[PDB]
Amino acid sequence: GEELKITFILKDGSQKTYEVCEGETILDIAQGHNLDMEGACGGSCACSTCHVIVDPDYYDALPEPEDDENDMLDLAYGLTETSRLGCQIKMSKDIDGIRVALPQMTRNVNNNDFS
């Protein structure tokens, strides 16, 4: 069954509700639709905001990532029972109407990485 949608709740707090293909990453719809959105991974670029929280409907089918990857989320405060990386898990046939919210971070200690 063809074409899908994604809701994101903004860092500023608005809701924005967009049409997409399957196989797209949440970081790739955030950066492909140019959501006003920054975060803890990759310089806020091609690796990206990382941090989302999902609806308890659409997480419930979903995988979880390594202790190095779920940490990239944990640099936000108060991290939720459905808070997750944009990046492991994409738009698929299971998702027809999915949401995420896009939370705020700033940590007391900070670092950088490059190739």
Does 87 sit near ligand FES (CB under 6 A)?
A: yes
Numbered residues of the known binding site for [2Fe-2S] cluster? 41, 47, 50, 87
Using CB under 6 A, count the residues that bind ligand FES.
12
Nearest Cα to Cα of residue 37 among 18, 55, 13, 54 = 13
Does 76 sit near ligand FES (CB under 6 A)?
A: no
How far is Cα 90 from Cα 64, in angstroms, rounded to an integer?
12
Interacting residues with ligand FES between 29 and 48 (CB under 6 A): 41-42, 47-48
List, comma-separated, the residues after which the chain is broken, a break being a C to N distance over 2.5 A; otherwise answer none: none
Minimum separation from the CB atom of position 112 to ligand FES (A): 14
Nearest Cα to Cα of residue 33 among 41, 42, 21, 51 = 21
Minimum separation from the CB atom of position 2 to ligand FES (A): 27
Strands 99-101 and 4-9: parallel
Binding site for ligand FES (CB under 6 A): 27, 41-42, 47-50, 69, 72, 85-87
